[PDB]
Amino acid sequence: TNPVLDVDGNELQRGQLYYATSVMRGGLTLAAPKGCPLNVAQAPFDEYSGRPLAFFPENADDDTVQEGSTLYIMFPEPTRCPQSTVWTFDRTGGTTSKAIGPHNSRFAIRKAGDASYQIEVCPCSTGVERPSCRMGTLGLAEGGKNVLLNINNESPH
């Protein structure tokens, strides 16, 4: 079909760590003030490569992530907030609080991937949007005409 590749030329595997490193204006993190639900945001300083992401297709298969097929995204690291590190869309931006739902549509928790300077994210089932940097306390993710292009590079290889 059309798998999503990493910066080395290799496919994306489910449960494996990748950085959402940006070819645009770095990676993504979990950031919110004071309290709790962390919101998905962009990494601040310059050593901040970001936090590693794990992508999980909805159906068990050959565990390869493909372009356009729906999935779940999560930061598989423990956080200071009790909410799930899996991505939710509020309808606002992306939060961390996501259940999983293998029924019919209406579930602002399923994302997807599609190409352009690499791949992109689509909060879609029948197609809703394509997130971009919010921009202003934290570089949150929303949806725009100028959209956040990122390349997925693997944490230890």
Of 34, 80, 91, 157, the residue at the interface with a copy of itself (CB under 8 A) is: 80
Of 3, 79, 125, 129, the residue at the interface with a copy of itself (CB under 8 A) is: 79
Shortest gap between Cβ of 79 and a copy of itself (angstroms)?
6
- Work out whether 124 is an interface residue with a copy of itself (CB under 8 A): no
The DSSP result for 112-139, as a single string, is: -EEE---EEE--TTTT-----B----S-
Q: Are 81 and 39 in contact (CB under 8 A)?
A: no
- Work out whether 76 is an interface residue with a copy of itself (CB under 8 A): yes
Of 4, 28, 65, 86, the residue at the interface with a copy of itself (CB under 8 A) is: 86
- Work out whether 35 is an interface residue with a copy of itself (CB under 8 A): no
Site for a copy of itself in 38-67 (CB under 8 A): 52, 54, 56
Sequence-separated (6 or more) residues with CB below 8 Å from residue 62? none
Sequence-separated (6 or more) residues with CB below 8 Å from residue 45? none
Of 22, 29, 39, 97, the residue at the interface with a copy of itself (CB under 8 A) is: 97
Whichever of 50 and 52 has its CB closer to a copy of itself, that residue is: 52
Q: Are 113 and 151 in contact (CB under 8 A)?
A: no
Q: 71-74 and 113-115: which strand pairing?
A: unpaired
